[PDB]
């Protein structure tokens, strides 16, 4: 289990995808041209997980950049690490999807999907032992949501034994007050429940709330929100990119974090929370389990943790971490299910992220995530009851029953979380 193929689709997908590569290239000592300027062997030990080694000792990201809008390619290219990507890996359409999931999934998106799969095949055949795929996208637009989910199903058909992981950005009217976004998100969640093994839910509602109320940024920009996303993405991929006591991979993460196949939506968290430009182990364990530090707008104290993985980064006593993690579990005992013994796993990595001596990243599989799905479901139902803008979707060949099926599957998912929240050991 070594190589991961990364795919970034649509505007959000490419924006957060580019920031991810900038942040992890800096951690591994890779500069914008692909040369290694680092001072530690631990940076190169698992470099092949995300980068290919090209001639001249240059490291190239194993990344595919996809969009129906051509303009996104220009913004990516103009970025600091914009020239590090393989030019043959940019697959871009002529006209975007206009925030329409049906255009992304059935018409414009379906015309470009075979071209993307050709590039996926060439990157996959170049792998010694491919683990699986990582996709970055939003669920509120048309390309990342509609075309992204179509791409997931097609990759799933050609590589059924590999892991499919997504970083999926959930919409909020606080960041984008576009009323068709609950339709695009609900249609996508129906696809992700069936076709992904693990999904990190990154919620624009939570990102806005952290920026506005905790960091005191009066008018949060996408750069402010993406600073939290990039810190989270660095944190959750730590055990894939550095040696550590565990030989972690995407399949061992899924086997240990997903007790029921449909409940594979994680709530990530991060401590310390910081703004652009601008702790002890007990403080990090406490902040890490606080609702204000979650990247999904859900209160974990309204549900129960099925499983948790925590990664501490920096120089610290592993004995101290073991004791503080045992303490949080004893005091917060009513927020963990009692029928999954030893359901909290901790990892410590010596290399901290940029600008911090110590950090903690949390990955929770909590039943409180039903609050996120309920928020989207209520908005979807308010719009769908009045059939508002439904012709924009049915005009692209979609059937009205697909909306009903997506709504019913998301309400069934909420009921499944409630079922395990109320279950007892006896």
């Amino acid at each position: 289990m070594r190589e991961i193929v990364h795919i970034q689709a649509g505007q959000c997908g490419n924006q957060i995808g580019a920031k991810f590569w900038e942040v992890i290239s800096d951690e591994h000592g890779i500069d914008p041209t692909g040369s290694y300027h680092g001072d530690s062997d631990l940076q190169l030990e698992r470099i092949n997980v995300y980068y290919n080694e090209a001639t001249g000792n240059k490291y190239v990201p194993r990344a595919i950049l996809v969009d129906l809008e051509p303009g996104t390619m220009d913004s990516v290219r103009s970025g600091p690490f914009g020239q590090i990507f393989r030019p043959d890996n940019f697959v871009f359409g002529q006209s975007g999807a206009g925030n329409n999931w049906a255009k992304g999934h059935y018409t414009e998106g379906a015309e470009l999907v075979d071209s993307v799969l050709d590039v996926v095949r060439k990157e996959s055949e170049s792998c010694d032992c491919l683990q699986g795929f990582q996709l970055t996208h939003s669920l509120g637009g048309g390309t990342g949501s509609g075309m992204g989910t179509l791409l997931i199903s097609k990759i799933r058909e050609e590589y059924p034994d590999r892991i499919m992981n997504t970083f999926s950005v959930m919409p909020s009217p606080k960041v984008s007050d576009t009323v068709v976004e609950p339709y695009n998100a609900t249609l996508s969640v129906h696809q992700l429940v069936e076709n992904t093994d693990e999904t990190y839910c990154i919620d624009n509602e939570a990102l806005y709330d952290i920026c506005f109320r905790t960091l005191k940024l009066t008018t949060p920009t996408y750069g402010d929100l993406n600073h939290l996303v990039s810190a989270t993405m660095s944190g959750v991929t730590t055990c894939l990119r550095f040696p550590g006591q565990l030989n972690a991979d995407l399949r061992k993460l899924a086997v240990n974090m997903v007790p029921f196949p449909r409940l594979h939506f994680f709530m990530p968290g991060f401590a310390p929370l910081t703004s652009r430009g601008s702790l002890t182990v007990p403080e990090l364990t406490q902040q890490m389990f606080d609702s204000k530090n979650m990247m999904a707008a859900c209160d974990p104290r309204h549900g129960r943790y099925l499983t948790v993985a925590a990664i501490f980064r920096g120089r610290m006593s592993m004995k101290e971490v073991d004791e503080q993690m045992l303490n949080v579990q004893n005091k917060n005992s009513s927020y963990f299910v009692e029928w999954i013994p030893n359901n909290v796993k901790t990892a410590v990595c010596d290399i901290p992220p940029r600008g911090l001596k110590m950090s903690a990243t949390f990955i929770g599989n909590s039943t409180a995530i039903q609050e996120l799905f309920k928020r989207i479901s209520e908005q979807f139902t308010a719009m769908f009851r009045r059939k508002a803008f439904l012709h924009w979707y049915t005009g692209e060949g979609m059937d009205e029953m697909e909306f009903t099926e997506a709504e019913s599957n998301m309400n069934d998912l909420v009921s499944e979380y409630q079922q395990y929240q109320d279950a007892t050991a006896d």
Partner: protein, 436 residues
């Protein structure tokens, strides 16, 4: 002389195997390149150490051992370490993708890709033997490879080597140093499928070894290196009778005769004393009575359980060092005047004793002090049922909700295999209750 082949499966089996073979070399006087100056017969021999080591025409003493893992990182450390020239290069077998902590991947889908190669390499070692007695198999219960691949291997060895004995050294899981949430499932599934195919199994409870490292060796946070060094000292004490001259447990059949009254209750408890920190180099030397009494203290056991709550069916005391036989007899006589030791009414109420007069060897870099006398007690007690009950309860909590079962069914396993395995464990718990 009758040969023994050791098989090390998965990360725990391989890492414990590396520590064991290092200690065996130091005990026998074998250098890291395989040269043994004290061996006067070059190119062959029938000495007791030849049960574990073959000899080449150039005087190289090679372990009769196979290391197997479904991924290569752990075995790669053996291939490049201090003892890299000791093993047969073809004896170190690796796949490319591991069992992802899933018994079903180890047994049914990934494991099937390398099983025939492992059996052909074992046959090459078996063909070099004049009188193969059987196999020592080292593995974890919790790992996907240690659980699933070991069960598949033991099933095939029973068909290809029908009359040969099979002994296991199995690592029983602990929360303190665990890898996976599903280890209770892997542990029950491998126990059910291997039960018929194993003649005697020594379980090593990682929590027991962890507590001994913390309490006796003053190691604040023990790592696998600290656990494995202590485990290797205990394993050496158990296998010494097969590698040196002696009168107790001289072959694999005798382990069954002495310790296993009935086939299914084949899990002896090991206790070892004294365990003293290397920082106490000038420690007072403990007498035969003191180390013998320490064998009946639950803190020195390899498995956490209370033998005062159970009954004994067999008890063997294996001493190493400056031990006078009359002092052993006197210490045992005192021990028999103690209410805490009860034997079942159908076994002779006696202790079997073996003495090897060479003290234990300590490895450079280890955590143990040198001692003049040490003892390993092997007993078959019904109190070991407490370890199975603890594991069965963790299995039941998750299985009642069918948590994680989809990962096993998705890798070629039928859901009914979980119920069949759990029913066999309920029968095993009742087998101990029926004895006492």
């Amino acid at each position: 002389m009758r040969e023994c082949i050791s098989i090390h499966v998965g990360q725990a089996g391989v890492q414990i195997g590396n520590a064991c073979w290092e200690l065996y070399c130091l005990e026998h006087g074998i250098q890291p390149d395989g040269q043994m100056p004290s061996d006067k017969t070059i190119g062959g021999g029938d000495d007791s150490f030849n049960t574990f080591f073959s000899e080449t025409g150039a005087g190289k003493h090679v372990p009769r051992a196979v290391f197997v893992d479904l991924e290569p990182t752990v075995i790669d450390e053996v291939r490049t370490g201090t003892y890299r020239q000791l093993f047969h290069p073809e004896q170190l077998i690796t796949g490319k993708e591991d069992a992802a902590n899933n018994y079903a991947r180890g047994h049914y889908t990934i494991g099937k890709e390398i099983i025939d190669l492992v059996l052909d390499r074992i046959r090459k070692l078996a063909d070099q033997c004049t009188g193969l007695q059987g196999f020592l198999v080292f593995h974890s219960f919790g790992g996907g490879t240690g659980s699933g691949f070991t069960s598949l291997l033991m099933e095939r060895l029973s068909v290809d080597y029908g009359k040969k004995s099979k002994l296991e050294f199995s690592i029983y899981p602990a929360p303190q140093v665990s890898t996976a949430v599903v280890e209770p499932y892997n542990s029950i599934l491998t126990t059910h499928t291997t039960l018929e195919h194993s003649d005697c199994a020594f379980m090593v409870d990682n929590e027991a070894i962890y507590d001994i490292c913390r309490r006796n060796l003053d190691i604040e946070r023990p790592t696998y290196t600290n656990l494995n060094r202590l485990i290797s000292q205990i394993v050496s004490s158990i296998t010494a009778s097969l590698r040196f001259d002696g009168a107790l447990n001289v072959d694999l059949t005798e382990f069954q005769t002495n310790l296993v009254p009935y086939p299914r209750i084949h899990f002896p408890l090991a206790t070892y004393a004294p365990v003293i920190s290397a920082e106490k180099a000038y420690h007072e030397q403990l007498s035969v009575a003191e180390i013998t009494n320490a064998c009946f203290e639950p803190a020195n056991q390899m498995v956490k359980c209370d033998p005062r709550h159970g009954k004994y069916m067999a008890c063997c005391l294996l001493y190493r060092g400056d031990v006078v036989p009359k002092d052993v007899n006197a210490a045992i006589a005192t021990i028999k005047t103690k209410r805490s030791i009860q034997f079942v009414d159908w076994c002779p109420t006696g202790f079997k004793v073996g003495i090897n007069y060479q003290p234990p060897t300590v490895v450079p870099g280890g955590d143990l002090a040198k001692v003049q006398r040490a003892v390993c007690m092997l007993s078959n007690t019904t109190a070991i049922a407490e370890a199975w009950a603890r594991l069965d309860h963790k299995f039941d909590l998750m299985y009642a909700k069918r948590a994680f079962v989809h990962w096993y069914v998705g890798e070629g396993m039928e859901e009914g295999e979980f119920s069949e395995a759990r029913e066999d464990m309920a029968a095993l718990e009742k087998d101990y209750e029926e004895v006492g």
